[PDB]
Structures are given as structure tokens and as C-alpha cells.
Amino acid sequence: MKIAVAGSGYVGLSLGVLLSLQNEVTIVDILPSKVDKINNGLSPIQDEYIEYYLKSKQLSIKATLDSKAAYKEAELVIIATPTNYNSRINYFDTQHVETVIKEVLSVNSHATLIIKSTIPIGFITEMRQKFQTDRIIFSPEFLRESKALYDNLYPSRIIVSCEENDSPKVKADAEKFALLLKSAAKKNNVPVLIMGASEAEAVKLFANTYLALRVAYFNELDTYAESRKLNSHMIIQGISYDDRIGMHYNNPSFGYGGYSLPKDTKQLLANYNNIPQTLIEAIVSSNNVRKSYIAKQIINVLKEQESPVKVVGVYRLIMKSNSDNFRESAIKDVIDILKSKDIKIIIYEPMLNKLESEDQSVLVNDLENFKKQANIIVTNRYDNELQDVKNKVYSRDIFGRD
Amino acid sequence: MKIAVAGSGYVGLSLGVLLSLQNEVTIVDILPSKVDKINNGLSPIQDEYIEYYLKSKQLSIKATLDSKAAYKEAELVIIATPTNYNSRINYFDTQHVETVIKEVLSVNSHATLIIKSTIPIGFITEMRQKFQTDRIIFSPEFLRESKALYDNLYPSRIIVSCEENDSPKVKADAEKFALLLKSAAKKNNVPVLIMGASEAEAVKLFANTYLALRVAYFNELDTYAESRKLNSHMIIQGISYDDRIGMHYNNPSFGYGGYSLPKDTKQLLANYNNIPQTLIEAIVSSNNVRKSYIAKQIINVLKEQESPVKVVGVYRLIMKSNSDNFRESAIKDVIDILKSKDIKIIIYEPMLNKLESEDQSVLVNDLENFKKQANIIVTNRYDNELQDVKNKVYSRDIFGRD
Numbered sequence: 147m148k149i150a151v152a153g154s155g156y157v158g159l160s161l162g163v164l165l166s167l168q169n170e171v172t173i174v175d176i177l178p179s180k181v182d183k184i185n186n187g188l189s190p191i192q193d194e195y196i197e198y199y200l201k202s203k204q205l206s207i208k209a210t211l212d213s214k215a216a217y218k219e220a221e222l223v224i225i226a227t228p229t230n231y232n233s234r235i236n237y238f239d240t241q242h243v244e245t246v247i248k249e250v251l252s253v254n255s256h257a258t259l260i261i262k263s264t265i266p267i268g269f270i271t272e273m274r275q276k277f278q279t280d281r282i283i284f285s286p287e288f289l290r291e292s293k294a295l296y297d298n299l300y301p302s303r304i305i306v307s308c309e310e311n312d313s314p315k316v317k318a319d320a321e322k323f324a325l326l327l328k329s330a331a332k333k334n335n336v337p338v339l340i341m342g343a344s345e346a347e348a349v350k351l352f353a354n355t356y357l358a359l360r361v362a363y364f365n366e367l368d369t370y371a372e373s374r375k376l377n378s379h380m381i382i383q384g385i386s387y388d389d390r391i392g393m394h395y396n397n398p399s400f401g402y403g404g405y406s407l408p409k410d411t412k413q414l415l416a417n418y419n420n421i422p423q424t425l426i427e428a429i430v431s432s433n434n435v436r437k438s439y440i441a442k443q444i445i446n447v448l449k450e451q452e453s454p455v456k457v458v459g460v461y462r463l464i465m466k467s468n469s470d471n472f473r474e475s476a477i478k479d480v481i482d483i484l485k486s487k488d489i490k491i492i493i494y495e496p497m498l499n500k501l502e503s504e505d506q507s508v509l510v511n512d513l514e515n516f517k518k519q520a521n522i523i524v525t526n527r528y529d530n531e532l533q534d535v536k537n538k539v540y541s542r543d544i545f546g547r548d
Numbered sequence: 549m550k551i552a553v554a555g556s557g558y559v560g561l562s563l564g565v566l567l568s569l570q571n572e573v574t575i576v577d578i579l580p581s582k583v584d585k586i587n588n589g590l591s592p593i594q595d596e597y598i599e600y601y602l603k604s605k606q607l608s609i610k611a612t613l614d615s616k617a618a619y620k621e622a623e624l625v626i627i628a629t630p631t632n633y634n635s636r637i638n639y640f641d642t643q644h645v646e647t648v649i650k651e652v653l654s655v656n657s658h659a660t661l662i663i664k665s666t667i668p669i670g671f672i673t674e675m676r677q678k679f680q681t682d683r684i685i686f687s688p689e690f691l692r693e694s695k696a697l698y699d700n701l702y703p704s705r706i707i708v709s710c711e712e713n714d715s716p717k718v719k720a721d722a723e724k725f726a727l728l729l730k731s732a733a734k735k736n737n738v739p740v741l742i743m744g745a746s747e748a749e750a751v752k753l754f755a756n757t758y759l760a761l762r763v764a765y766f767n768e769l770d771t772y773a774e775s776r777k778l779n780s781h782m783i784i785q786g787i788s789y790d791d792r793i794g795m796h797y798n799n800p801s802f803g804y805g806g807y808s809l810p811k812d813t814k815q816l817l818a819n820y821n822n823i824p825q826t827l828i829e830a831i832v833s834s835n836n837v838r839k840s841y842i843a844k845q846i847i848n849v850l851k852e853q854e855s856p857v858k859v860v861g862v863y864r865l866i867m868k869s870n871s872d873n874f875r876e877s878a879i880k881d882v883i884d885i886l887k888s889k890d891i892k893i894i895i896y897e898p899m900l901n902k903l904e905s906e907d908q909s910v911l912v913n914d915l916e917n918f919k920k921q922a923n924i925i926v927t928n929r930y931d932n933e934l935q936d937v938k939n940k941v942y943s944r945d946i947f948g949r950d
């Protein structure tokens with residue numbers, strides 16, 4: 147089948163390559179760099195499986211900047227563009243998704259549009275009324291960065307929306323798409339759920355909010371443990387042996403980061419409007435409180451030192467273990483708070499070439515010089531190459547993952 | 549070994565019977581009824597395994613009101629008395645545990661005292677200083693009511709506290725006790741953790757608080773679902789397929805109830821004092837908000853009816869599925885809120901013989917009359933015997949469990 151995918155990020159590229167094994171895929175983007183990379187078998191992001199598929203699999207995939215040409219030819223269009231949370235409007239800025247819907251509808255009268263980008267609850271319904279069509283459905287995406295294609299090869303589940311009174315074509319396409327994902331998976335028993343759009347939009351926001359809830363909870367337990375001089379690993383291990391709690395996704399950090407959890411928890415809170423709740427709002431505030439607590443602990447360690455200048459060395463800015471980006475990295479907010487103090491900040495981050503011109507932080511990518519200059523080394527996740535300066539490293543990492 | 553157990557409740561009786569297979573157990577209580585029942589092979593509470601063991605196993609177990617005689621003879625004393633949360637003092641009322649420690653210490657100079665009752669973080673340390681001894685340790689209890697003995701036959705884990713500078717005897721007893729629990733289990737691979745008292749006290753409060761967090765979260769998702777006319781089962785099923793979230797302990801209700809979750813979440817919040825957090829306090833408030841929301845939904849359904857008198861029929865007061873008690877049952881708080889309105893309340897609850905004299909609610913244990921009189925039937929968990937009046941039943945139960 148001829149499929150067009152809007153957006154070549156983690157989601158777009160993962161799905162485009164997944165679907166390119168037995169379908170004719172065209173990935174659309176507005177960045178020439180990504181288009182040329184893809185057209186030459188190169189992945190714009192670090193991902194073991196995407197890199198492997200582009201390099202060694204028979205794929206029917208190409209990229210283009212020509213939006214209209216790609217969408218006109220498509221039988222199905224998958225939308226995977228950004229959906230940033232905008233603090234000014236207290237909501238997701240859905241312009242990049244809407245602009246694609248408009249473009250697709252203006253040149254294609256038969257294709258069903260499938261949104262993979264995380265969206266507000268009620269968005270499909272709002273878009274269907276705005277554009278006066280039923281050819282728009284949602285299929286949430288659950289992949290994790292660094293396992294973008296892997297998670298669609300071995301998905302937890304597949305969900306696609308369909309409304310009772312949708313046209314036979316849209317209903318058939320919703321089903322066909324769910325089955326294209328199922329058949330492309332290498333995993334044998336993948337649950338497939340077909341539900342209303344609002345239910346599906348809710349699934350995605352409530353699932354990510356639960357993951358943020360869990361990180362936030364283990365981080366508050368960790369705040370307590372550090373404040374009371376208790377062994378955090380012993381306590382976490384003790385509660386995690388209850389299989390209703392579990393030994394996964396329970397490693398303390400400076401806060402939940404990444405492009406997704408921060409913005410999605412905020413979006414869910416907004417969708418609640420005045421519906422009664424107290425936990426949803428606390429999951430968002432808990433991250434802020436955790437970050438401020440971490441900043442104060444660092445500040446207190448520093449004032450216990452006798453040095454003319456106090457220098458904090460930040461070891462890495464990656465948003466989680468094995469990440470290739472710093473989107474909403476928790477340590478960056480901690481840094482912001484430390485900056486309001488008389489503290490010099492140096493950053494060790496190989497993936498970065500230069501800091502923005504106004505940044506007062508100083509990038510020191512020679513590890514040895516970095517260790518020498520830092521009075522204290524702050525890092526979200528520990529790494530063995532810090533072994534020789536271990537006694538001046540501050541981190542709440544316990545399990546070395548996530 | 550000669551073991552004395554203080555308290556014949558779910559915890560005390562479960563452990564006393566468990567340990568009575570290969571040890572000489574004496575259970576102590578202040579209620580003559582419980583002592584006579586136990587001495588005659590009868591369980592004071594409903595529990596399939598305890599009833600089976602008392603009736604068909606070779607047990608070395610007896611009960612007595614004679615506290616001092618039991619404690620003087622003991623080699624180990626297990627304390628399983630109440631630890632209620634007291635709203636006036638903003639803390640657990642630990643008098644029943646302290647009174648037992650005092651009694652044991654006054655007549656026994658060698659036995660180590662093991663607390664199974666859930667206690668405040670820092671309590672062992674406080675008690676050790678108050679009584680000036682190190683012969684007091686904590687071993688949290690994780691059993692569920694209705695599976696009291698079953699959960700100790702198949703425990704998730706075993707935890708016993710020990711401090712680095714405790715006497716060789718207390719350290720040896722801490723270990724021996726952990727191994728008495730391990731060897732008495734029928735489960736083969738049970739993790740055994742030895743940790744500091746404060747860490748162990750924290751494990752118990754943080755584990756129960758996570759279970760309350762989970763119930764509170766799925767209940768807030770349910771509030772949202774009902775408010776927006778969405779299918780709650782579809783949404784919950786959709787997020788639960790993520791194995792990091794899970795298909796367990798996720799059934800909506802009128803709130804988390806039982807003697808334990810309500811009081812333990814409140815106790816943890818108190819132990820936090822001013823340590824930074826926002827989630828811990830929200831887990832407690834979320835229950836209140838959920839209950840008030842449920843009461844309003846019922847009130848709204850009622851005002852849509854044209855009857856001279858509006859009657860709400862409450863189907864059962866049990867605190868959870870298969871429970872034999874109503875401790876902190878969520879529906880009771882909902883009832884309290886409905887009472888401030890012009891609503892007649894009738895209750896169907898076979899396990900109850902009479903309501904307190906001042907109660908304006910009326911107990912109607914003839915099911916047929918109950919169904920006839922109720923304009924709307926409210927219940928925490930559905931039951932098939934309500935099939936014929938299904939259209940007037942209000943419940944948020946989805947999965948028929950917990």
C-alpha cells in the first residue's frame with residue numbers, strides 16, 4: 147500500500163521504516179537534512195534497529211520536502227509531527243498537526259488520516275467538526291526513544307480509533323491500519339483494541355501520566371530517604387518485591403524528563419478543566435518540588451567547601467539513560483536554579499558542540515579538565531568513568547537505567 | 549520454640565497459626581470471645597486457610613487473657629495489636645503497642661520483641677530510647693484480609709529489622725525470626741531482606757501508600773471518564789496493557805477503604821513533616837474528592853426522579869470484595885454526605901444485625917423489600933443477585949474484584 151508519513155522524528159521514522167517492508171512509504175519533513183539522510187539510508191537519530199533496517203533490509207522508503215506530492219499519492223497518511231505544550235495558552239499547540247490535516251485534505255479526497263502524535267482528549271472530534279469530515283482517526287504511539295522501532299516490532303498493544311457512525315471506508319481503513327501494525331510486528335500475541343477517539347486519546351495521556359506518577363512517587367520517597375539519612379535502595383527494593391508494585395521503572399532521578407512526560411502530564415491536567423481531582427495536578431507540581439529539592443542539596447554541599455570559587459561540574463545533559471537528546475532534561479532545570487546563585491557551571495556533554503551564546507555555563511568536553519575544575523560533580527545517572535572522582539559525585543541514581 | 553503473639557486479629561491469628569505448626573504458640577488478647585473461640589478451634593474472622601488449619605492441622609496453639617503468664621514464658625514475642633490513626637494528634641495512636649512492650653519487658657528479660665503492627669517511621673528508635681533497650685525490632689506485615697494466612701504461606705517477601713550495633717542475641721533473634729517465617733512458608737523462593745528499622749518502617753508505609761496511590765489514580769481517571777461520558781473499561785484496559793502499568797489492582801470504586809490504606813497514607817504524610825512533597829498529601833485528599841464526587845453523582849440521579857420520597861438503597865457495606873468487615877468502607881463516607889440531604893437511606897447488609905441506635909439509616913435485610921423501596925441502588929461492587937433491578941443500580945465497579 148502507498149503510505150505517506152508526516153514527520154521524520156522518533157515516531158515518524160520508526161513507523162515509516164516499519165511499514166516500508168511491505169508497503170510503499172514516503173516520509174515527509176520540512177528539514178532538508180532529514181530528507182537527504184533518509185534518502186541515503188541514514189537515520190537522523192540514534193536507534194539500533196532503524197539504523198540496522200535502513201542499512202540491511204529491503205525497504206520501499208523515500209523522503210521528500212514535497213508535501214503535496216506525497217499526500218496526493220497516498221492511500222493512508224500517518225501524522226507524526228510535534229505537539230508541544232505551550233505554557234501561554236495552557237494547552238498543546240496543535241498547529242503542526244492541523245497544518246498537515248489541512249494540506250492532506252486539500253489534495254486527497256479518499257485517504258484516511260491517522261494521527262500518531264499525542265493529542266488533546268477531544269481533538270479528533272474537534273478536528274472532525276473544524277474540517278467537516280470523518281476521515282481523521284487516532285492511533286496512540288507507545289514507543290520509547292532509543293527503542294523506537296524495537297517497540298513497534300514488539301508492541302505492548304495496538305489501538306486505533308473508529309466511531310460507530312463513521313463511513314464504511316474510514317471504519318475499514320481504521321481496521322486495516324491496526325492490522326498493518328499487527329502484521330508488521332515480530333511479536334506473536336499483540337492485543338488490538340478498537341475504541342472511540344476520545345477513549346483512545348485518554349489512554350495515551352493517562353498511560354504517560356501514570357508513568358510520570360510512578361517516577362514522581364519514587365522520587366518523593368527518595369527525597370524522604372535522603373532527608374532522613376535512610377538507605378533509599380533498601381526501601382525501594384523492599385516495596386518493589388510486592389509484584390503489584392514491581393521491580394521496574396523505579397529508579398530515582400532529578401525529575402521525570404524527555405519531550406513527552408513533562409508536556410503530556412500538563413496536557414492531561416488541562417483537559418481535566420474543573421473535573422474533580424487532586425492527584426493529576428500534584429503529579430505536575432511534584433516534579434518542580436523534586437527539582438528544587440535537588441538544587442538545594444547541591445547548594446548545601448557546596449557551602450561546606452572552602453574554595454575561592456565554587457564550581458559545579460554537570461556530567462551529561464541527556465534526558466535519560468542511553469538518550470541522544472536533552473529535551474526537558476531534568477538536570478537543566480536544576481542548573482537554572484543553581485545559576486541564580488554565585489556558582490560557576492561547567493558542562494561535560496560530548497554530544498554538544500557549543501552552548502547558546504548567552505549561556506554563562508561553560509562547556510568543558512575534555513573529561514580530565516572537567517573533573518579537575520569541578521568542586522562537585524552533578525549527574526542524573528552515574529557512569530564508571532567517574533570512578534576516580536567518585537567521592538565528589540552527587541547523583542540519586544540507584545539502578546543504572548531509565 | 550515458645551512464641552507469644554499479642555493480638556488475635558487478622559495479623560495476630562494468621563501468624564500465630566502459621567507459627568504453631570512447628571512452634572509452641574500462645575496468642576494473647578483482651579477479648580474473652582476471641583480467646584474461647586481460638587481455644588476451641590474456631591477462627592474469629594472469615595479466612596479459608598485459618599479455618600482449615602485450626603480444624604485439620606496438628607497445631608500447638610492456645611489463647612489466653614493472662615498477658616503476663618504468656619509473656620513471661622515466651623522466647624520471642626510478636627506484637628500485632630491495633631495502630632489506629634488519630635485525627636486529633638495528627639498521628640498513629642501507638643498506645644496498644646507500647647502497653648504490650650511495657651508488659652513484656654517487665655516480666656521477660658531475654659525475649660526479643662518483634663512488632664508486626666504497622667508503625668510510624670522512627671518508632672523502633674523512639675521505643676528503644678524510651679524503654680532503654682535494643683530488644684525491639686520491626687518486621688512489616690504484607691497480608692491481605694481474606695487471604696491472611698494464604699499470604700504468609702505464599703509471601704511476596706520477608707523483611708526483619710536489625711541495627712549494626714545491636715546485641716548478638718537481638719541480631720540472632722532477628723535472623724531466626726526471618727527464617728521461621730521463611731521455613732513456614734510453602735512458597736519456595738521467598739526473598740528475605742534484613743535492614744535498619746527506619747528503612748523497614750518506611751517500606752511498609754511507602755508500599756501501602758503506593759497501593760492507595762494506584763487506587764486513587766484509577767478512581768480519578770474514572771471520575772474523568774464518567775464526567776466526559778467515556779467508556780472507563782476501554783480506557784483502563786488500554787493503559788493496563790502496558791506491562792509497566794499492569795492489569796491488576798485497577799478496579800474503580802467509591803474510594804480506597806479498609807483499616808489500613810486510609811490510616812497508613814495519613815501516617816506517611818505526617819512522617820513527612822515539612823520534607824518537600826506534593827504527591828503524598830494529594831493521595832490522601834484524592835480519596836475525599838473522589839467520595840464527594842460519587843455522592844454528587846447519586847444526588848443528581850435522584851433529582852431526576854419524580855417520587856414523593858427519594859430513597860437510596862445501599863447494597864452492602866463491606867470494605868472490599870469478599871470482606872467480612874466495614875472498616876473505613878468508602879461507601880460509608882458517601883452515605884454520610886447523602887445524609888445531609890433530604891434522602892432516606894436503607895441498607896442491605898446481611899453481616900449486620902442492627903445499626904447503632906442513633907443511625908437514621910434503616911437496615912432492610914430482606915433483599916426483595918430492599919429492592920422495592922429503593923429508588924436507586926448504590927453499591928461499591930456489583931453482584932448478580934441485583935440483575936432484576938440492574939437499571940437502577942449505580943456502581944463504578946468494572947472488573948468484579950478488589
Ligand SMILES: NC(=O)C1=CN([C@@H]2O[C@H](COP(=O)(O)OP(=O)(O)OC[C@H]3O[C@@H](n4cnc5c(N)ncnc54)[C@H](O)[C@@H]3O)[C@@H](O)[C@H]2O)C=CC1
Binds near residue numbers: 177227246265
Ligand atoms: N518521541 C517519542 O518517544 C514519542 C513521541 N510521541 C509523539 O509523537 C509526536 C512526534 O514526536 P517525535 O517523533 O519525538 O518528534 P520529533 O521532534 O523527533 O520529530 C518531529 C518531526 O516533524 C517535522 N515536522 C514539523 N512540522 C512538519 C510539518 N508541518 N510537515 C512535515 N513534517 C513536519 C519536524 O521537522 C521533525 O523532524 C509528538 O506528539 C510526540 O509527543 C509519541 C510516542 C513516543
Ligand SMILES: NC(=O)C1=CN([C@@H]2O[C@H](COP(=O)(O)OP(=O)(O)OC[C@H]3O[C@@H](n4cnc5c(N)ncnc54)[C@H](O)[C@@H]3O)[C@@H](O)[C@H]2O)C=CC1
Binds near residue numbers: 557576577664690692
Ligand atoms: N488487617 C490487615 O490486613 C493488616 C493489618 N496490619 C497491621 O497489624 C495491626 C493489627 O491489625 P489487625 O490484625 O487487622 O487488627 P484487629 O483489629 O483485627 O485485631 C487487633 C486485636 O488486638 C487485640 N488487642 C488490643 N489491645 C491488646 C492488648 N493490649 N493486648 C493484647 N491484645 C490486644 C484486640 O482485641 C484485637 O483482637 C495494625 O497495625 C494493622 O495496621 C498489617 C498488615 C495487614
Ligand SMILES: O=C(O)[C@H]1O[C@H](OP(=O)(O)OP(=O)(O)OC[C@H]2O[C@@H](n3ccc(=O)[nH]c3=O)[C@H](O)[C@@H]2O)[C@H](O)[C@@H](O)[C@@H]1O
Binds near residue numbers: 288291292396397548
Ligand atoms: O510518549 C512518549 O513519547 C513516550 O514517553 C516515554 O518514553 P521516553 O520519553 O522515551 O522515556 P522513558 O524511558 O519513559 O523515561 C521518561 C523520563 O522519566 C525518567 N525516569 C524513568 C523511569 C525511571 O525509573 N526513572 C526515571 O527517572 C527518565 O529518566 C526520563 O527522563 C514512554 O515510556 C513511552 O511509552 C511513550 O511512548
Ligand SMILES: O=C(O)[C@H]1O[C@H](OP(=O)(O)OP(=O)(O)OC[C@H]2O[C@@H](n3ccc(=O)[nH]c3=O)[C@H](O)[C@@H]2O)[C@H](O)[C@@H](O)[C@@H]1O
Binds near residue numbers: 690797800803
Ligand atoms: O496493611 C494492611 O493491612 C494490608 O492492606 C492491604 O490489604 P487490605 O486492606 O486487605 O485490602 P486491599 O485488597 O489492598 O484493598 C484496599 C482498599 O482499596 C480498594 N481497592 C483495591 C484495589 C482495586 O483495584 N480497587 C480498589 O478500590 C479496596 O476495595 C479496599 O477498600 C494491602 O493489600 C496489604 O498488602 C496490606 O498488608
